[PDB]
C-alpha cells in the first residue's frame, strides 16, 4: 500500500530514536492509531534519497485499519516517490502514455491497494478501477474574512470640505446683521454667543423671524449630517461572499477582485472545455502561481482576493487558521476512492465494507475527529 503525504488526512512525522513514534491522545482521550511509514527521507529531487522509516497516521489510515481488521489484511504502508497523484508525462518517444505516481506504481506492480485522497476521473478510471467514495467534496471558493470596520474615516465634512467655511461665514454674517438690526426702534459678543447656542445644543419682530430662519438653517445641517452617516453605514458593507460559480462578480473578473488557478490542475483542464468561460480565461491566465502553497501565502498576504481549490484542503486550512473562511455553496463536485487494479478480487468486499461503515456512522466520527478541528 502506498500513500501520499496529505496534511488534512495523512500526518507523516519522523519516528523517535527507538524507531517508533510517540503515542498521543485525542480530545476524547482515545489513543491515536499509528502505522510504521516507509518512504524517502527527502521529497525534493536531486537529493540522496534514503528509505528511512517514517510514521504516518490520520483518517485514511484509520479507515485502512478498520478495513484490515474487518477483512483479514496485513499491510505495509509506503510513500510516493514522485510525490504526485499521477498523470501523463512526456519522455523519450513521447507518443507513449506512461503513468507516474500512485497510478504508475499500481500499474507497475509496486503497490496493490491505494487508500488515500485520489480523485475519481474518467481518465484515471479508464485503466484503474475505483471503489465507492468515502465522502463527496467539490472545489469551492476561499476568501479572507476580516473584522468589519467603518470606512467613513474622513475629516472636514465627507466630500464638501468648504461646508464648514460656508457655515462659519453664514454664522458670522447672521450675527453681524443681527447686531446691525439691534439698533432699531448686545454690543460685543452676545449675538455670536446666542447664534452658537441656537445652532448647537447648548444654553422686535425682526428677532423672531431671524431666530426662525436660523433655526431652520440649523435643522437642515444636522439632518444632512445624520443622513450622510446613515448612507455611509448602509453602504459600509465591503463585499458580499461568493455564493458559487453563478455569482456575477466572478463572471466578470477585474483588477479590483483577482482570482485564478495554479497552473494545470484538474481545474484548468475542466475550465479549458468550458467555452462559456472565455471571460474567465482572459483574466485568470495572468494570475497563475507556481504552487498552491505560494498561492495561499499570497492570499494571506492580501495579493489574491480569492483562491479556488478542492474543499478537502481549503476547509482544512480554514479550520486551522481563522484568517481564511471558505465560501461558495458547491460546484463541480467530486469524490474520493481506492485505487485498485482491474483484476483485484477485493472490489466487492471493499465496497460492501465501505458502505457498511458509512451507514454505521463511522465516517461522521472520523470527520469530526480528523477534519473539523477548532471551528472558528
Amino acid at each position: 500500500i502506498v500513500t501520499i503525504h496529505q496534511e488534512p488526512f495523512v500526518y507523516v512525522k519522523p519516528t523517535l530514536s527507538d524507531g517508533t513514534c510517540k503515542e498521543e491522545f485525542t480530545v476524547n482521550g482515545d489513543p491515536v492509531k499509528k502505522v510504521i511509514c516507509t518512504g524517502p527521507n527527502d521529497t525534493s529531487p536531486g537529493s540522496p534519497r534514503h528509505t528511512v522509516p517514517q510514521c504516518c497516521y490520520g483518517f485514511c489510515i484509520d479507515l485502512l485499519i478498520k478495513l484490515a481488521r474487518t477483512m483479514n489484511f496485513t499491510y505495509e504502508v509506503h510513500l510516493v516517490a514522485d510525490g504526485k497523484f499521477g498523470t501523463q508525462e512526456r519522455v523519450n518517444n513521447s507518443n507513449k502514455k506512461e503513468w507516474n505516481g500512485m497510478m504508475g506504481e499500481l500499474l507497475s506492480g509496486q503497490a496493490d491497494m491505494i487508500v488515500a485522497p485520489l480523485t475519481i476521473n474518467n481518465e484515471r478510471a479508464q485503466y484503474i478501477e475505483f471503489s465507492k467514495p468515502f465522502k463527496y467534496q467539490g472545489l469551492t471558493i476561499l476568501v479572507k474574512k476580516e473584522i468589519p470596520r467603518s470606512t467613513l474615516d474622513s475629516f472636514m465634512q465627507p466630500f464638501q470640505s468648504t461646508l464648514w467655511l460656508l457655515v462659519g461665514l453664514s454664522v458670522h454674517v447672521v450675527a453681524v446683521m443681527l447686531y446691525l438690526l439691534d439698533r432699531f426702534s448686545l454690543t460685543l459678543s452676545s449675538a455670536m454667543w446666542f447664534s452658537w447656542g441656537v445652532l448647537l445644543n447648548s444654553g422686535s419682530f425682526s428677532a423672531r423671524i431671524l431666530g426662525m430662519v436660523w433655526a431652520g438653517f440649523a435643522m437642515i445641517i444636522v439632518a444632512s449630517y445624520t443622513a450622510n452617516l446613515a448612507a455611509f453605514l448602509v453602504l459600509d458593507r465591503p463585499e458580499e461572499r461568493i455564493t458559487g460559480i453563478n455569482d456575477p462578480r466572478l463572471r466578470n473578473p477585474s483588477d479590483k477582485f483577482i482570482y485564478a488557478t495554479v497552473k494545470q490542475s484538474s481545474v484548468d483542464i475542466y475550465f479549458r472545455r468550458q467555452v462559456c468561460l472565455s471571460t474567465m480565461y482572459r483574466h485568470m491566465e495572468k494570475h497563475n502561481y507556481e504552487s498552491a502553497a505560494e498561492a495561499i501565502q499570497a492570499v494571506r498576504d492580501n495579493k489574491l482576493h480569492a483562491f479556488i481549490w478542492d474543499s478537502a484542503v481549503l476547509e482544512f486550512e480554514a479550520s486551522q487558521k481563522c484568517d481564511l473562511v471558505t465560501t461558495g455553496e458547491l460546484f463541480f463536485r467530486s469524490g474520493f476512492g481506492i485505487g485498485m487494479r482491474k483484476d483485484s478480487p477485493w472490489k466487492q468486499n471493499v465496497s460492501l465494507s465501505i458502505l457498511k461503515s458509512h451507514e454505521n456512522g463511522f465516517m461522521e466520527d472520523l470527520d469530526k475527529t480528523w477534519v473539523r478541528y477548532q471551528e472558528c
Partner: peptide
C-alpha cells in the same frame, strides 16, 4: 449635495426678504 446649496440659498433669500420687510415696516 447640489440640492443643499439650492435649499440654503432659497432659505437665505426668504430670510433676507423678511428682514427687508420688517425693516421697511
Amino acid at each position: 449635495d447640489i440640492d443643499n446649496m439650492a435649499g440654503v440659498f432659497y432659505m437665505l433669500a426668504a430670510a433676507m426678504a423678511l428682514s427687508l420687510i420688517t425693516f421697511i415696516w
